[PDB]
Design an enzyme around this catalytic site. Structure first.
Site, PDB file in Angstrom:
ATOM      1  N   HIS A 195     112.908  19.778 107.180  1.00  0.00           N
ATOM      2  CA  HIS A 195     113.079  20.433 107.300  1.00  0.00           C
ATOM      3  C   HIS A 195     112.371  21.612 106.579  1.00  0.00           C
ATOM      4  CE1 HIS A 195     116.984  22.578 105.340  1.00  0.00           C
ATOM      5  NE2 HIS A 195     116.958  21.283 106.378  1.00  0.00           N
ATOM      6  N   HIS A 215     109.298  28.854 103.267  1.00  0.00           N
ATOM      7  CA  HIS A 215     109.093  28.372 104.646  1.00  0.00           C
ATOM      8  C   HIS A 215     107.685  28.669 104.340  1.00  0.00           C
ATOM      9  CE1 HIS A 215     112.695  28.524 105.091  1.00  0.00           C
ATOM     10  NE2 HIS A 215     113.179  29.148 104.604  1.00  0.00           N
ATOM     11  N   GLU A 218     109.922  34.767 106.582  1.00  0.00           N
ATOM     12  CA  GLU A 218     110.735  34.641 107.569  1.00  0.00           C
ATOM     13  C   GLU A 218     111.454  36.707 107.060  1.00  0.00           C
ATOM     14  OE1 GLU A 218     113.564  31.995 105.972  1.00  0.00           O
ATOM     15  OE2 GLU A 218     113.033  30.443 107.225  1.00  0.00           O
ATOM     16  N   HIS A 251     112.294  30.874  98.503  1.00  0.00           N
ATOM     17  CA  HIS A 251     113.532  31.572  98.528  1.00  0.00           C
ATOM     18  C   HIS A 251     114.271  31.018  97.565  1.00  0.00           C
ATOM     19  CE1 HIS A 251     113.623  32.421 103.583  1.00  0.00           C
ATOM     20  NE2 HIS A 251     113.187  33.582 102.196  1.00  0.00           N
ATOM     21  N   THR A 263     119.429  31.222 106.605  1.00  0.00           N
ATOM     22  CA  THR A 263     118.837  31.894 107.503  1.00  0.00           C
ATOM     23  C   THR A 263     117.789  29.706 108.391  1.00  0.00           C
ATOM     24  OG1 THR A 263     116.469  30.825 106.296  1.00  0.00           O
ATOM     25  CG2 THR A 263     117.097  33.225 106.660  1.00  0.00           C
ATOM     26  N   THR A 264     118.826  29.014 107.960  1.00  0.00           N
ATOM     27  CA  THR A 264     118.563  27.604 108.573  1.00  0.00           C
ATOM     28  C   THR A 264     120.729  27.581 108.889  1.00  0.00           C
ATOM     29  OG1 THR A 264     119.169  26.479 106.220  1.00  0.00           O
ATOM     30  CG2 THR A 264     117.188  26.493 107.550  1.00  0.00           C
TER      31      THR A 264
HETATM   32 ZN   LIG Z   1     114.898  29.468 102.882  1.00  0.00          ZN
END
Ligand SMILES: [Zn+2]
Length: 257
Positions: free
Chosen positions: A61, A93, A103, A116, A195-196
């Site tokens: 991911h 991301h 995000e 992040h 956020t995941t």
């Molecule tokens: Zn992240």
């Protein structure tokens, strides 16, 4: 399993992780006019001089640069935080095109990508226990726009061809995350979540106002990564961002006027 596709993407996550529809989910849109300047907020203290990276991994991911967090060596404190938070990893991301990828958004603007830097509260002893606490993590978020290259990112970019597919990892030592920071540490802050999945509501978010610039060639190399494992049909790792979630009962505070 969860992902970013039509059948397993963000709109599906709530089935496995009901907290996806919770009261402090991330990311959010940062409405800059409604964010309140808080003169009581302290300057952020980022002390990364002794940071020690260990490995880089494609987890299907994103790619994570993982750090040795067994000593007090790369710490985030001050700002909105009580106590000390230790760096464990960073990841990004990004989008399929420069017009999307972040995000968080700023007055609905999407950046090309978002970094992040994930830190855990040392009062909880390690990351796994920290994520079970409401003040367990502090994530420093930094926007990326496409323009001039970020020289400090290039060492990351150049190892990506060795971790193209899910499950691949490589040794990755002596990477200095100071090279990923913008000039200013002015920030917005609010309480939120991973956020995941598992989307735990354990994060104090600190989102820097000043983006870093990376080159088109740098982000193009992010887009060569794969979601799939080696020997599977190729699906490029792009658009691995969760969209903005409802702010609900939250206030975003600004460190600057
Ligand atoms: Zn992240």
């Amino acid at each position: 399993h969860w992902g970013y596709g039509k059948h397993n993407g963000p709109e599906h996550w709530h089935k496995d992780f009901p907290i996806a529809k919770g009261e402090r989910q991330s990311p959010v849109d940062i409405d800059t006019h409604t964010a309140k300047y808080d003169p009581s907020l302290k300057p952020l203290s980022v002390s990364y001089d002794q940071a020690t990276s260990l490995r880089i991994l494609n987890n299907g991911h994103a790619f994570n640069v993982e750090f040795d967090d067994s000593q007090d060596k790369a710490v985030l404190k001050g700002g909105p935080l009580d106590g000390t938070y230790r760096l464990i990893q960073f990841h990004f991301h990004w989008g399929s095109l420069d017009g999307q990828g972040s995000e968080h958004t700023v007055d609905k603007k999407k950046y090309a990508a978002e970094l992040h830097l994930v830190h855990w509260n040392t009062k909880y002893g390690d990351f796994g226990k920290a994520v079970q606490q409401p003040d367990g993590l502090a994530v420093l978020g930094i926007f990326l726009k496409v323009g001039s290259a970020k020289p400090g990112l290039q060492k990351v970019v150049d190892v990506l061809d060795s971790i193209k597919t899910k499950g691949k990892s490589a040794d990755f030592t002596n990477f200095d995350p100071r090279g990923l920071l913008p000039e200013s540490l002015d920030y917005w802050t609010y309480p939120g979540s991973l956020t995941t999945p598992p989307l735990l509501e354990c994060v104090t978010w600190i989102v820097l106002k000043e983006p870093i610039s990376v080159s088109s060639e740098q982000v193009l190399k992010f887009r060569k990564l794969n979601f799939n494992g080696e020997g599977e049909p190729e699906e490029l790792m792009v658009d691995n961002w969760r969209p903005a979630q409802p702010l609900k009962n939250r206030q975003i505070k600004a460190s600057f006027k």
